[PDB]
Design an enzyme around this catalytic site. Structure first.
Site, PDB file in Angstrom:
ATOM      1  N   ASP A  62     118.874-109.934 -75.895  1.00 31.65           N
ATOM      2  CA  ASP A  62     118.591-110.726 -74.708  1.00 31.65           C
ATOM      3  C   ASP A  62     117.125-110.532 -74.250  1.00 31.65           C
ATOM      4  OD1 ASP A  62     118.728-111.921 -72.217  1.00 31.65           O
ATOM      5  OD2 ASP A  62     120.490-110.864 -71.570  1.00 31.65           O
ATOM      6  N   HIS A  93     117.260-114.108 -77.785  1.00 33.24           N
ATOM      7  CA  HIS A  93     117.612-115.270 -77.008  1.00 33.24           C
ATOM      8  C   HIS A  93     116.831-115.404 -75.729  1.00 33.24           C
ATOM      9  CE1 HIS A  93     120.435-113.734 -73.841  1.00 33.24           C
ATOM     10  NE2 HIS A  93     121.082-113.026 -74.751  1.00 33.24           N
ATOM     11  N   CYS A 146     122.422-113.470 -63.675  1.00 34.13           N
ATOM     12  CA  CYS A 146     123.493-113.553 -64.646  1.00 34.13           C
ATOM     13  C   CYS A 146     123.925-115.014 -64.705  1.00 34.13           C
ATOM     14  CB  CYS A 146     124.658-112.667 -64.208  1.00 34.13           C
ATOM     15  SG  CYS A 146     126.137-112.754 -65.200  1.00 34.13           S
ATOM     16  N   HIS A 155     126.754-116.279 -64.949  1.00 29.11           N
ATOM     17  CA  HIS A 155     127.991-116.545 -64.203  1.00 29.11           C
ATOM     18  C   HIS A 155     127.924-116.190 -62.710  1.00 29.11           C
ATOM     19  CE1 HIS A 155     129.127-116.006 -68.524  1.00 29.11           C
ATOM     20  NE2 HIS A 155     129.486-117.252 -68.267  1.00 29.11           N
ATOM     21  N   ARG A 159     119.121-120.744 -74.970  1.00 35.67           N
ATOM     22  CA  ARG A 159     120.243-120.807 -74.055  1.00 35.67           C
ATOM     23  C   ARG A 159     119.900-121.737 -72.893  1.00 35.67           C
ATOM     24  NH1 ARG A 159     122.722-115.689 -70.682  1.00 35.67           N
ATOM     25  NH2 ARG A 159     122.580-116.655 -68.613  1.00 35.67           N
ATOM     26  N   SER A 193     132.660-114.259 -72.444  1.00 34.14           N
ATOM     27  CA  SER A 193     132.278-113.435 -71.309  1.00 34.14           C
ATOM     28  C   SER A 193     133.421-112.669 -70.637  1.00 34.14           C
ATOM     29  CB  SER A 193     131.619-114.300 -70.239  1.00 34.14           C
ATOM     30  OG  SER A 193     131.163-113.483 -69.156  1.00 34.14           O
ATOM     31  N   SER A 216     132.996-111.855 -67.680  1.00 38.92           N
ATOM     32  CA  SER A 216     132.969-112.516 -66.364  1.00 38.92           C
ATOM     33  C   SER A 216     134.126-113.515 -66.217  1.00 38.92           C
ATOM     34  CB  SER A 216     131.608-113.211 -66.097  1.00 38.92           C
ATOM     35  OG  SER A 216     130.467-112.331 -66.235  1.00 38.92           O
TER      36      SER A 216
HETATM   37 MG   LIG Z   1     121.490-111.767 -70.144  1.00 41.48          MG
END
Ligand SMILES: [Mg+2]
Ligand SMILES: [Mg+2]
Ligand SMILES: [Mg+2]
Ligand SMILES: [Mg+2]
Lengths: 422, 422, 424, 423
Positions: A145, A172, A183, A185, A220, A309, A311
């Protein structure tokens, strides 16, 4: 052309990939000497192979080298490196943070190095024992990330380089505003213009070319949930802009969120990345199919990634049979890299909570149960019960014996309790 | 005398403690300004209170902030920082090492700092929620491993200071040769002279005095298993020297190991430490009684520490009844600080190996089982299921609202999947 | 009210200071325990006293602890910590960077901590020798560069806390876009809206309040040279936007740079900081007087800071006499904090180029020349020729003797070549 | 045999070098994948070339990347990395320390990485400008201080490896007890047995071998001034032990120090290293010659290293002419690597003391003097007056333009005050 600048790049690696810069730009910008980044080369070629050979490649987010090692031992073929987890318990400010790009931009690459180093030790251990590896390779590719690039293209450029040096296979980048990153989410997300994110992706690609590695780039989009946008300067974004609603006090534009902007952005990002990824609110295969189909009408065969996820509340949203088949179904749609971002955080935190609770209640009985569970897990490949071997005591013993031509009086393993009681 | 140099010290804190240096030495060597180390003070005094008031204080070795946090959440009252685990998965060389003092001397204090920082965030979170704390205090004392001091008295001096700044409450130093340091339960350990170790305990005590903190010092002896000694210069060690063996190729003397030299060394170290620790090969209550009894004839009421080691095969040595009562029985002997050194390493590695294996074989079904297990634990105190809250998203939201007088458009929690699905 | 949250703050510390947050917000956001930040307290209060009592407090940019130590030894009363220098040669990515916020956000505070640690050893050495200090205090206040806060308000908030922990006395924040940050003296700067920079200043204040220290906040504007702005959303910025020229391909607005938007921004920032600073293109006392006069019309007695930039060509701009009086004149206008940002980088890089050059040419002759120059400076208070003493060898010898009861066989100084060959 | 394990090692690289371990040991201990250490290869091969072709290679101790960059721009061909300097102002514990191995063992290699990275940026800048380089190469070899190896042989092994990763060309190890390590020019040094140092040396070599790099090992002895020894177990040390005096309270043996034990230890260390080095109390050509001659009796052609230490008072020891010729004379004896250890520290601290003092006395006049001197040095090759170019602002501008196909609004240099005021 670019293939001679990235010698390890396989045939076809850059099919359908566009760059803003030239091959001459790369030579001009890479300095005068060849520096090799072996773990980046190996990792990126192995990832490329895996995503084209497997049904799909699935991963879990590791927050430590040890976690990475056990993943690879258990047979997983890739390692995911979550920025969320770096923020929580593994960053270079030595603090716990929410997932808001609060920690210093070096944190992610520092963790990636940690993971590769532990895997290197795992490898050195088994190579020294002389009976072959217990896995295909210890150097499973890391997909990491880079959040929003920690600012502008140059910040994207620098974090891409850092990841390559640390030996990451893929990286990414998301189309959020770094200064207000969240985040995926969480609410309150702010998008950057489609063009501004194409510049970050291109910065990432320039970093890779300049390092001479065929590092993978994952684009993304956070547009499914995001209702704010920094600027409407890009005609591709303007159709989703609610002009009647006006700007916020911060100066942000208000936009219509959902699958449509995710499709438009995904199609616009496609030529400048190796995989595309849409963040989603729910684990929804139909939505996943809908997105996959629209991307593939514009770019047939484009490889996709999907965040499985934590989440999400899984058994609330889906029944047992759909859960079972989920990754498999996504795989057939073209989602060839799938990952449970926060697995490491949940496993570490639950496990220790449950052990500490039991320890408080029954002290050593609680610990013996873990140990016995460890012992029962050896039939299945677990080795960490013999903790001395695991971390390399036997390897360093052999290093000692080679240094002293055999005559060291102070070797570790011979008279250990591990040798005597295991 | 020393009490005025260490204002936070409680009544009787230094009863029966001896120093090589004077109060004036401390004033000469501490610089001209008062710098406070708040967490080291609070931690030292809380640990002092706990170990006297409670039947025993037991701990688990934490290799990260999050592990520490869950330990405190679960009700445990103290935290152990393992050097073995720092070497394995949490050092400043970013490598995996066996337990041989191979990592850089700053690694332990850095992890201590991480742990306190995580605890601080946890305290910030609950303070801001405004309904009181879910624990007695988040700032559970940390007892940390300074191994063999990383060299001489000056190295011991420096690592003690570093731990004080990181906010450790207690620090242990063992009588091994730093250049050949091993895990207490491996072969090939080399002791240093009784006098040399007293020098390090005194370096450490001067460190605390100079920092103005009543930090606890734990003296450890590895004489139970060690068959080597660097020099026979101390008359107190000569009776255990096997002069018939001759020296080894490195110039080390051969000694007769067992409980007799632990007792001798322990008695000799007692006036220069707050607690005393003898490493053992097996978890043996009668041996612990015999050691406690011998130490107590010379030094009545002396507080002892015991390593309940994972380097033992618990069920092979003991029956279920003895395992269940083990710590309680040690407690009544005067072992007021007891700790499973490698718990963090075994929980982390077991848990992930098992998760990764289920995930390989059954993908999301394996992860959903973890999550369901998490939710089920909420009744017993578990909170990390709501992962956004756990790491401070709510806390930082409140920060943002205080900064913007309540108007920010980009707060995280209201429109989160956490708030909607949990 | 806020004074009980910050026990070390002297009377009137927060006069004329507005805050977006309440005292209750602070109590609610600071945790349940008291943690002290001694060097930050001491530094902030000493800096506060100096800027009110001295004609002006002047400093040089330090890129290392040793550099800072010699500044204090030489008699300077404050230290500047330059972000430019962090980027160049002292950051946590171990890289040389231009001044564009490319390095990790922890770099500045880590250098602050290094600096205070060096000063700490210097103080221990002299305390241990028992003849009193050779300076007013080794703990000169550090004023440190937080650049654009490395993002939004929460990033600003975090770097402030990091600096407080590291012992910084004051911290400056500038109204640039972190993601495109430049050296004040480079082109292509992009400003953020006046309101957004007030947000960062308040984040900083909340940080200080929550840490419970009276740390100084210096608000800087880059509006003199900046021709770009992220958004025209703030009415206060609209009078300076060129709407005729349009937005750039990135969507930035183009603005009319110069003294006027600096004055306006400065006056808006005033209640939310302790010193105001306007970056300039040239060392110009007339512009500096105009700026001081306008700010003072709105806010009488406001303390200002001035950057005496090495990015200026000083002899090209000014004659010897103006160069000589420059900082004295600025002091009278109210510029109570003045600093040569890149002093450390130029003295380090010049010094070594010239030494290396002499060495290539004539080997030990070039070094001997340095060594004699060091001997020659001792009359003026230089001590570093005796390098073993300087870094604490004597201090640790005394530590070992306290440990070993005066008996160690392995003390360093008595039989050293320093003791044998560097006698008066 | 070892040449296939170390692909970049030139012909004859290991002539006369002995190893405790085997080629097979290396294969067993290095893992299953080939990881490349480009800068360490280039550095080591370059250092090897230079020390066989130049009359002597001279270097100064850099405590920062910037310092090293000016060294290389000035025309120096190698860089020394001082542990003393790491202790003083450039270590990973962020403190000022005396030279006693009190800083964490990763500090020297971290500094090695910083230096190589600055040099890399310097090279990037010039390569993007397109007019060729202004130096033979920016990647001058770094010879780095591993001190006493920070413990036992395994600690030596690890520090060697960290230096190779950081891109060092050569690393030095000394026969002192790491737990009581000192600057060679302080008192209270304690030596380890000849054999114990040989294991450190072999550990270093095994590390180079396992890493697949031909990194140079320099063996240092501190026997000239050291009067203490951990153990008399090695019969090679025993002739120098004063047995009548007995052991000290700590258990150390006491030894007759001087040049004779340096010669014996050097001769014993010789097969396990590429260069040998004897620390001295004074800069003494005669002592240097005696050392060289005795080592060469046993090992013809052996390359030596000599520390031109600021811990000496130079003009008190020597006249201007002997100072003038000092390095050239040493070269002729076989001292092909010579270095002023604390050069960086003295330059940094002297220069800033004087700048600050001038600044206190007359403010901007003092700084303007620095700036004029800088301008005056541009004829002699100095460039850092244009500080924006120097740190790569021009290079990153070019990076932005490639990213954006020439279309960035926000480039830095065109409208900078550097471009306007330094023309
Ligand atoms: Mg991240
Ligand atoms: Mg330990
Ligand atoms: Mg700056
Ligand atoms: Mg050295």
């Amino acid at each position: 052309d670019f293939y001679s600048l990235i010698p390890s790049a396989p045939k076809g690696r850059f099919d359908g990939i566009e760059r803003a810069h030239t091959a001459e730009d790369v030579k001009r910008l890479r300095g005068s000497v060849e520096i090799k980044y072996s773990l980046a080369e190996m990792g990126a070629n192995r990832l490329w192979k895996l995503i084209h050979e497997e049904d799909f490649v699935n991963a879990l987010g590791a927050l430590s080298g040890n976690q990475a090692m056990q993943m690879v031992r258990a047979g997983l073929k890739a390692i995911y490196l979550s920025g969320w987890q770096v923020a929580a318990d593994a960053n270079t400010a030595s603090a716990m943070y929410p997932d808001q790009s609060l920690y210093p931009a070096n944190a992610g690459p520092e963790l990636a190095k940690r993971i590769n180093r532990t895997l290197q030790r795992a490898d050195q251990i088994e190579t020294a024992e002389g009976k072959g590896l217990s896995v295909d390779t210890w150097f499973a590719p890391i997909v990491a990330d880079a959040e929003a690039g920690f600012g502008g293209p140059l910040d994207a450029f620098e974090i891409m380089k850092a990841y390559i040096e640390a030996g990451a296979a893929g990286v990414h980048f998301e189309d959020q505003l770094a200064s207000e990153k969240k985040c995926g989410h969480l609410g309150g997300k702010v998008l950057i213009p489609t063009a501004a994110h194409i510049r970050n992706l291109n910065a990432a690609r320039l970093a890779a070319d300049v390092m001479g590695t065929p590092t993978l780039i994952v684009a993304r989009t956070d547009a499914e949930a995001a209702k704010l946008l920094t600027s409407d300067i890009d005609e591709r974004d303007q159709p989703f802009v609610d002009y009647e609603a006006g700007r916020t006090a911060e100066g942000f534009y208000q936009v219509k969120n959902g699958i449509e902007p995710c499709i438009a952005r995904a199609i616009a990002y496609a030529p400048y990345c190796d995989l595309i990824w849409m963040e989603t609110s729910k684990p929804d295969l139909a939505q996943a199919r809908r997105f996959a189909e629209a991307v593939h009408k514009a770019h047939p065969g484009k490889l996709l990634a999907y965040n499985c996820s934590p989440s999400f509340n899984w058994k609330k949203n889906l029944d047992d049979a759909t859960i079972a088949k989920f990754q498999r179904e996504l795989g057939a749609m073209g989602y060839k890299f799938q990952f449970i971002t926060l697995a490491g955080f949940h496993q570490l935190n639950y496990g220790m909570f449950e052990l500490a609770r039991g320890y408080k209640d029954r002290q050593m009985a609680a610990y013996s149960e873990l140990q016995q569970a460890e012992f029962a897990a050896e039939a299945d490949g677990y080795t960490a019960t013999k903790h001395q071997r695991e971390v390399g005591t036997g390897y360093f013993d052999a290093v000692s014996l080679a240094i002293t031509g055999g005559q060291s009086s102070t070797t570790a393993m011979k008279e250990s309790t591990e040798t005597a009681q295991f």
